[PDB]
């Protein structure tokens, strides 16, 4: 189509913000299963420990 | 689970140590009751022989 590089422009811009902005909120939620999977090993060495 | 565990570890431990008092204090009870016992038969046996 047309250049219009208005458009480009904005994109780059807005997805440099709306990426690196919100990249901490999800670096928040990579912990939980993983802790999860912490309680899941530990249940399962408190019946050794029996 | 985990904590029923160690309740029922130290319920061994203090009936085990239980076992130990009661069995050691019978042993040295029948041991001096068998000493009084042959003491009584060496009083008659003396006697037996002085009167022969």
Not at chain 2, 26 to 40: F, M, P, V
């Amino acid at each position: 189509i047309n250049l219009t590089l208005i458009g480009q422009a904005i994109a780059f811009a807005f997805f440099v913000a709306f990426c690196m902005k919100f990249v901490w909120p999800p670096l928040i939620n990579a912990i939980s299963e993983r802790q999860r999977k912490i309680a899941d090993g530990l249940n399962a060495a408190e019946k050794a420990k029996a | 689970d985990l904590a029923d565990a160690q309740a029922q570890v130290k319920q061994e431990l203090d009936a085990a140590k239980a076992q130990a008092a009661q069995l050691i204090e019978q042993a040295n009870r029948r041991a001096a009751q068998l000493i009084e016992e042959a003491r009584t038969q060496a009083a008659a046996e003396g006697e037996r022989i002085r009167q022969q």
